[PDB]
Symmetry: D2
Subunit: 256 residues, 4 copies
């Protein structure tokens, strides 16, 4: 309740899924939180539910939306300590030949350039507060994923960008880290599974992809984010895996 008292946090895509779990974790640590989302439904209800969280409608791909997000955060709360770049999307499975450069550009706009834009606009205020940036990347940026060339590329970019920016902002006391979740049970996971011939089988495979035998929860990503913000003062440029061990060992993926 006090680990991050008196601090101000912006969470993009905070209306549902991982983002909402990160919102709740920061509120529970004593922070005031600005929920940014392009859709009103979840975020507006979360603002009613949580004292200390407020909702601001903002599409992170629209630069003037993000400019307003930052200026309204400062106007209303007087400081900015942490930005969590969580907004992002996973398209359905697509074979390489079914992808397009246009679709690839549009996904880069959300998953990469939206993170870039908010970070850039927030950094002057984070420097004043010796605050920090937390990017939500993905395990599959590191190890790959099938039928997801554009998504994997965007997350490779986020993880790498995190390290570059950590180098540049270290002289100013601003840390820049990322979390790479694996399979987290969210509305996006549920939506993608419902597209499959056997959704139930897809979900069962997703649970057994982890040595721990289950998918992760938004609250567990949220706890990792609170750690990075509030207690990881000698961490910068790290990639914090929240994956249940999916990257470990051999699995189903004589010598001719």
């Amino acid at each position: 309740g006090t680990r991050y008292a008196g601090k101000v946090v912006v969470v993009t895509g905070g209306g549902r899924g991982i983002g909402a779990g990160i919102v709740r974790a920061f509120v529970n640590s004593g922070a005031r939180v600005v929920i940014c989302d392009k859709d009103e439904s979840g975020g507006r209800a979360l603002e009613q539910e949580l004292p200390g969280a407020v909702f601001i409608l903002c599409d992170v791909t629209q630069e003037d939306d993000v400019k307003t997000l930052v200026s309204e955060t400062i106007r209303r709360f007087g400081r900015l300590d942490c930005v969590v770049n969580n907004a992002g999307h996973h398209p359905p499975p697509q074979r390489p030949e079914e992808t397009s450069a246009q679709g690839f550009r549009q996904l880069l706009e959300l998953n990469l350039l939206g993170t870039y834009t908010l970070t850039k606009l927030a950094l002057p205020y984070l420097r004043k507060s010796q605050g920090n940036v937390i990017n939500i990347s993905s395990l599959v940026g590191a190890i790959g994923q099938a039928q997801a060339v554009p998504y994997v590329a965007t997350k490779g970019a986020v993880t790498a960008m995190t390290k570059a920016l950590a180098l540049d902002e270290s002289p100013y006391g601003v840390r820049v880290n990322c979390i790479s979740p694996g399979n987290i049970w969210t509305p996006l996971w549920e939506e993608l599974a419902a597209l499959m011939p056997d959704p139930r089988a897809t979900i069962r495979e997703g649970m057994l992809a982890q040595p721990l035998g289950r998918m992760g929860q938004p609250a567990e990503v949220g706890a990792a984010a609170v750690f990075l913000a509030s207690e990881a003062n000698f961490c910068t440029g790290i990639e914090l895996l929240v994956t249940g061990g999916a990257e470990l060992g051999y699995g189903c993926k004589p010598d001719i």
Copy 2:
């Protein structure tokens, strides 16, 4: 002279630097090589110099240029075995606040989407030949670099994309690998150093950034590419470091 005899290779940005070193290595291994470049000067001279190499003017950011590159390769040589996605650029040092989303998009077009586009157009022919893709990424995609947020992000994306595509194309016998060079002495390195207050000091630092005490050569990247194409039949999705050890150990980058 025979390790890759009878094979056909496309090298983008093959007119100078690393690309020209890769062109020479493949010619020396017995392959026929198509030199793709947006500038004529170097590539046209290389075509005159090397029996077995020919030059095709092609800007990899222009989709119809790349369509023509592939169709002309097939028309002239009847097969395609390896594409080397080397074309790319490093902008001058830029502090994060000096970058723009527009500049970032333009660098993504070259360093990432140009690699994507040629790979996509070539894959039908690589499937027929059980050929392979070699992407030239960078060490700094893995470890970061100062004053280079956009460049680092693009190379993070290339390395990650390499792994995704290796997964998707493995059922068809097409391997997809990347090389991550460190400091290689090229015209781009020389151009960037000439921008500095003390170019000579910049070059000296660049040499001592490697435990081996020197920068790398285009020929050394070229040898790694020939290995991946011709002898690495159980390698796919790997990142082959050609860096002189720059990523090893501690260097210049009490507890408060």
Copy 3:
């Protein structure tokens, strides 16, 4: 004060340095802590200082010492939830030709097999409590270090062993993670620096090896350990870097 209330933690080498910082962090989170050390001086004073910590003399290289450590922990506190394998040593700088197989074996006994032995003896009790293992490895296991072949090898082994054991113990709900610190200001760091021709210069270099410009603190490693024990329920087999960014970018470590 309550994040790990009611839990019982063993910290090896807890008498000073990183180990004592981990002891304090767990006490501050509400846990009861058993301080294991081969030397009495620091650990006995820490037991007097901290309600909720007690000292047990134990050399982790002596199997019967470790057997007694575990049985006394259970006898006195009735459960065991977390073991932190921190005991370890860094020999002075040694050129490869100045090392011996005998010295290498002895360092393996402490840095690797002592971690192995306590983990093995504790696992039956950790299974009952759904507890967890935290190994203190090092950044240099991942990236190397000069004049330290035996030390680097031992830490490579610890990090790898962490992943293997995480796989084996995941069906039982026992997580196994490691922390890889970089330069942490401790008595061992101070002792090694005092061996150098210019200790002050050695310490200054050690501070500037991190983008953050300082060495880390035992308290910061301790906070990472409390996170892994108490809040990282979907993390297993991870390597949590606490290094101030030392692994990022180029530093001091034309093409002939």
Copy 4:
């Protein structure tokens, strides 16, 4: 036939499996090769088969055997250019509680200290020749393996040691690299599979653990070793994966 002409190579455990594939690759590149093995059967036959290879009986865990191996290589061939530390063993599957510290020590003697000992005794001659070291580690040192805590630990140590030694020997022009194979079809693989309830099923799983759908061959590891020795002049401290992509993506290894 000429890539490594006039050079002298020692391959430990060269009598069968990966080691014999590395022997053949170097002979085919023009090198003279000393086959070291503790068993005579395979290595003696290979010496009869291959002009340019000779067999020396040597147990790499016995220091005087290794001293004699080096002195006999120099006495007979007058130089030493490359040592390939391939000798090693994988014990049968063992649950953590079924392992012993004694068994762990014995495996460290072979997989780690035997590599250390030959490297140390060879380095004076490698410095004279500007030669290189190639260690055969394993993919599972990086990602873990089930029921193999001691084996995984030894390979974690080898990979890490490779980087440390590359740092120390770089001022002298001696490169130190490792190869991390995945599933390679060898007599050891066949022996381990025959221990299983369903050997055929074990072998089928082993083939499908790779995106490429097969196990690797000793010849493919051998080609990687020849590359590292003869053409990778700007590579030191690297880990060259020869795994068929087993480390990529998700596999078989809702949120509670």
